[PDB]
Design a protein around this ligand. Structure first.
Ligand SMILES: CC(C)c1cccc2c(-c3ccc(CNS(=O)(=O)C4CCNCC4)c(F)c3)c(C(=O)O)[nH]c12
Ligand SMILES: [Zn+2]
Ligand SMILES: [Zn+2]
Length: 232
């Protein structure tokens, strides 16, 4: 009923949308992994009379449900999607998207890692993002590569019209007590990568983590703090 929806409020296989700003929504879904259930976020950005999707809803059937929820709530076609790293909460569902006519994109790094992992592979490579600090425009967003953090390939996404920073899995929610799933992380570089984000987007008003509740700029420092305390 209007609060941001949490893991125990969303059955696996349903998707919720949350209005962040004019023309900006998050999507929230839940999935089982290794015997536990987790929420995850993505982004939807209005692109004239079309929509840009950032990240899948973590699985094929969740992503089909995402498309249906978009049609219900927004009613504009999703024409392009960007996946912000290679894990299944970001690319699982790309095959569903592709067969719905969505053009799917990711950095070459992400594409390689997805293929090596046996995950679904976005079709199109996003060049111009290979060095930390790189940025490119993609429809109504800017894509930024901050350096290795949660994963070596993680991208963040900024919506300049709304000052919305979508950190993806490089950014954790304020209630977070741990650095999440660090199996592919660089704990040593993660703070430095977060500092790059902080420097590059000082006017961000809303920060959206890859999992959990949006907030303000404090999510960035909180993330650095939790990662440093984990590494220790
Ligand atoms: C490899 C990919 C597909 C993957 C698989 C499985 C899990 C993860 C996570 C992940 C894991 C745990 C948390 C925090 N625990 S929690 O359950 O969400 C929270 C607990 C107390 N209150 C509310 C709920 C978290 F935020 C993220 C991440 C990530 O960190 O990017 N990636 C994952
Ligand atoms: Zn991940
Ligand atoms: Zn994640």
């Amino acid at each position: 009923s209007g609060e941001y929806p949490t893991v125990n409020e969303i059955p696996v296989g349903e998707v919720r949308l949350y209005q962040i700003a004019d023309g900006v929504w998050s999507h929230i879904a839940t999935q089982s992994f290794d015997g536990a259930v987790y929420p995850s976020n993505g982004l939807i950005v209005r692109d004239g009379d079309e929509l840009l999707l950032i990240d899948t809803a973590w699985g094929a059937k969740n992503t089909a449900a995402l498309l249906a929820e978009i049609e219900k709530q927004i009613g504009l076609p999703v024409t392009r999607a960007v996946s912000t790293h290679f894990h299944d909460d970001r690319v699982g569902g790309v095959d569903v998207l592709r067969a719905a006519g969505v053009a799917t994109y990711a950095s070459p790094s992400t594409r390689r890692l997805a293929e090596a992992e046996g995950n679904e592979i976005p079709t199109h490579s996003l060049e111009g993002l290979s060095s930390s600090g790189d940025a490119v425009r993609f429809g109504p967003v800017e894509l930024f590569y901050p350096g290795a953090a949660h994963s070596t390939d993680n991208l963040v996404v900024y919506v300049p019209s709304a000052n919305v920073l979508y950190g993806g899995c490089a950014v954790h929610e304020l209630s977070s007590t741990s650095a999440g799933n660090v199996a592919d992380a660089d704990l040593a570089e993660w703070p430095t990568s977060v500092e790059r984000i902080q420097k590059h987007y000082p006017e961000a008003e809303v920060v959206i983590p890859g999992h959990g509740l949006p907030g303000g700029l404090d999510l960035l420092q909180h993330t650095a703090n939790v990662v440093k305390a984990h590494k220790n």
